[PDB]
Design a protein around this ligand. Structure first.
Ligand SMILES: COc1cc([C@@H](C)N2CCC(C(=O)NCc3cccc(F)c3)CC2)c2ccccc2c1
Ligand SMILES: [Mg+2]
Length: 315
């Protein structure tokens, strides 16, 4: 009987020494086993595997504790989905486009590239240590693990089309939006006591209008009756705000926003591009980059910097 020494882990932090019989497969001795994103459950240990680290499913209780401490989820399939996604995202390209890490287009990753480009331009802190380690490694240029994790946290798969706003919501759930708070006032003769206060994801997100200044001044509620119900922002305390609206022809003025998302197409087939404001306006589409002084396009998401805003409108 011949043998090799390997390591097994669920977080790449706590490694476990393992004696492996080379006459069996990794699936027989460990369960579902992954080697750098690759599935090696059906493969027998090779001599080259000596001293290398393998991912396995949380089969015992200590591994479950380690996996939860790293990923902040109880989903047992999470590691499997993450490894399956990494098996593809390791083959993607991540070029530095205008100081940001983008993704060369493949397998309908347009929304993924836009989300990755957005996250690099907003002050945001993640709670899962896995997310934070992959975030740093993505800003450094190795975003494969980051993309696979984002796919795993959103219950999306490689090749499936995605929405940037949905992805941003899923990731904001795993973010430290604690101090973030939003206070709004509903103006209508019916409503004579509307001082709504929101904390959490809904403190930094809104779906209705793209303009943040038009949100501060006032916008009409989608009332089916048309009661001229008015909504304006009373107070905002957050490092950023994300204004979303159905894809509409919008004029992006330089210096008035941080970044924005353009969506060209219909509902079941479209393409995401990312617009950023630097010294001029830049459009990143996968690995491609364009510049201009002005921009008008089908916008759907706009991000703005914020710290503390207080309204001027007295009730
Ligand atoms: C009225 O609200 C919208 C919103 C969108 C944008 C924001 N958005 C784009 C991605 C899209 C999506 O998830 N596509 C994948 C998909 C969805 C359903 C069936 C499939 F097979 C595949 C979700 C929505 C709009 C984008 C384009 C046109 C109208 C939109 C209206
Ligand atoms: Mg591929």
């Amino acid at each position: 009987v011949r043998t090799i020494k390997v390591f097994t882990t669920v977080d790449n932090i706590n490694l476990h020494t393992q004696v492996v019989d080379m006459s069996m497969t990794y699936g027989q001795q460990f369960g579902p086993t992954y080697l750098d994103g690759a599935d090696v459950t059906k493969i027998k240990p090779h001599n080259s595997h000596e001293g290398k680290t393998f991912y396995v499913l949380p089969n015992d209780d200590t591994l479950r504790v380690e996996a939860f401490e790293y990923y902040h989820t109880t989903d047992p399939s999470f590691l499997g989905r993450y490894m399956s996604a990494l098996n593809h995202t390791k083959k993607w390209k991540y070029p530095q486009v205008n100081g940001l890490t983008s993704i060369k287009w493949a397998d309908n990753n347009s929304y993924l590239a836009t989300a990755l480009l957005t996250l690099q331009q907003i002050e945001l802190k993640f709670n899962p240590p896995a997310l934070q380690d992959a975030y740093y490694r993505a800003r450094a240029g190795e975003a494969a693990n980051f993309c696979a994790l984002i796919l795993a946290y959103c219950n999306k798969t490689v090749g499936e089309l995605g929405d940037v706003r949905e992805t941003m919501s899923y990731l904001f759930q795993h973010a430290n939006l604690d101090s973030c708070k939003r206070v709004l006032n509903v103006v209508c003769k019916t409503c004579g006591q509307q001082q709504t206060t929101l904390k959490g994801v809904e403190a930094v997100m809104y779906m209705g209008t793209l303009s943040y200044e038009q949100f501060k001044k006032g916008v009409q509620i989608p009332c089916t009756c048309g009661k001229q119900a008015t909504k304006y922002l009373v107070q905002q305390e957050s490092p950023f705000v994300m204004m979303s609206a159905p894809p509409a022809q919008y004029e992006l003025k330089h210096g008035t926003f941080t970044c924005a998302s353009e969506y060209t197409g219909n509902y079941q087939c479209g393409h995401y591009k990312h617009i950023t404001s630097k010294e001029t306006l830049y459009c990143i589409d996968g690995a491609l980059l364009t510049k201009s002084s002005e921009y008008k396009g089908p916008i759907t998401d706009v991000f703005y910097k914020e710290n503390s805003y207080t309204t001027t409108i007295k009730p």
